[model samples]
Target: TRDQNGTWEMESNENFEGYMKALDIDFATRKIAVRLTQTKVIDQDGDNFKTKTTSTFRNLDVDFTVGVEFDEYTKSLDNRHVKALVTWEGDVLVCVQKGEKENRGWKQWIEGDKLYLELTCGDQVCRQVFKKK
Candidate 1:
């Protein structure tokens, strides 16, 4: 389906530990994070959206609107506060999170029955593919 709003189950998570390391996530946390199963539920209401990341260890909820800026607290994940903005760039939705970390962003888009998540921090990129559930 081409619709963006749906529940997605993790198909593959690659180099997530490396991306977490780039963010200065603790070694213990990184170890635990690698073993967690992640699922995403995206709901859109016009331009506004709520994207929930559910995991066995911790969960994160992000709320934002297309082309609008919002405050996002990466509480259970990194415990960092960020000024987040989501914008439509070409064919994909780009999420730029401004905080102490540089080049912290994620690209999300649907490709057939798969949802792609490219999480980037510094020189590391964690790629994840999810299937519709």
Candidate 2:
């Protein structure tokens, strides 16, 4: 079974405002985004994976296979188009989004009873913790 299954609810977040600001999010949008907690739903089969990041303000859906490159348009957040790739490194799932933003990526892994996700932009990294539900 995959380590990432079922649903996870955001327990806490750090520097999310800075991360959004790096993407040039408007003040009104940042107000709603920085305050909202995200729920993560993920599924995996063979090399294929699907994920959903949901919040009261918006939701983002993405799917890709390990080792395969795919088009990723971040619909809910900054709405940027990028070439995204997902890969496994030990027990962690790492993703890199290549486009206008430099050093854009995310890392997901479990530690203790918590699931940790780190989102990176130019310089800021928004760290978020989630728990199983």
Candidate 3:
């Protein structure tokens, strides 16, 4: 089902600086990323998904299927390579990124007219909320 297919505009970002810092992102990049308002464009078809994170500074695109593992390279962000797998836990879309960092993952869920994304790396977790547009 394409229940989550839509354009979500960021409403608020919580502790994103800590999460980026945990990833050891450079100071200049972190300064730009922390202030950028990100918009997520998600398209879901059955078990396949394509998501794009767009901002004035940079854009990132990811394509993956549920329960399938694939190599993911984070560009313009942390610039890291990871084995990424996405799965559904109830209604929440959970993504586990296995790499050098411990406990790195992301979870996305929709509630009412808002979309919630939790980004985690090491012990730091950053929450970003978006409203459907």
Candidate 4:
């Protein structure tokens, strides 16, 4: 199993709300996101694990192993279906989502004690910096 336990504080550094809006997120939901704190929990053993992304407005769950293929439903994700795969590039976990958009998905890495996440949807990209608390 993987160790995906702990709380992370997410901070949107640029056009955070606009990026979500571009994804068809409603005004009310976007408003809630502006003040939101998102956390990802990973419970793992060896190479298999379950992951959950939780926020004030939505909770997303996805389970997979290093080389497994899975479908990711944006559930709260503006109604778009994505085929996602996660792979490691060095120490960074890179995710590529194949869908309607030209470039979409996220990159996760840790710098010092901070966790950096870059999320892309359509042409809008949002960079979120998080601190492990």
Instruction: Indicate which candidate wins on TM-score.
Output: 3
lDDT of each: 0.88, 0.89, 0.91, 0.73
Assess candidate 2 and give its lDDT.
Answer: 0.89
lDDT of predicted model 3: 0.91
Q: Ten-residue segment with the worst summed lDDT in candidate 3?
A: 1-10
For each candidate, give its TM-score against the true structure.
0.93, 0.94, 0.96, 0.81
Query: Which digits, one per residue and each the tens of the lDDT, describe model 3 over residues 21-126?
Result: 9999999888989998999999989998988999999999999999999998887678899999999998999999999999999999989889999999999999
Q: How accurate is candidate 1 locally (lDDT)?
A: 0.88
The RMSD (Cα, Å) of candidate 2 is 1.4
Model 1, runs deviating above 4 Å: none
> lDDT tens string, model 2, 1-133?
2378769999999999999999888889998888988999989778888889899889888888999999988877787999999899988989999999998999989887788999999999999999999
Clashing pairs in 4: 1-44, 1-45, 1-46, 2-44, 2-45, 4-42, 74-77
lDDT of model 1, residue 80: 88
The residue pairs that clash in candidate 1, if any, are none
Question: Per-residue lDDT for 1-133 in model 1, tens only?
Answer: 3257989999899999989998888999999999888899999888888889999888888788899888888877677898989888776989999999999999988898899989999899999999989
Candidate 4, residues 1-133, lDDT tens digits: the string is 1233456676555667867877788898888877767887666556576777788777878777766667877776677788888877777777888887657877777777677778877788888887777
Clash counts for the predictions, in order = 0, 0, 0, 7
lDDT of 2 at 94: 91
Clashing pairs in 3: none
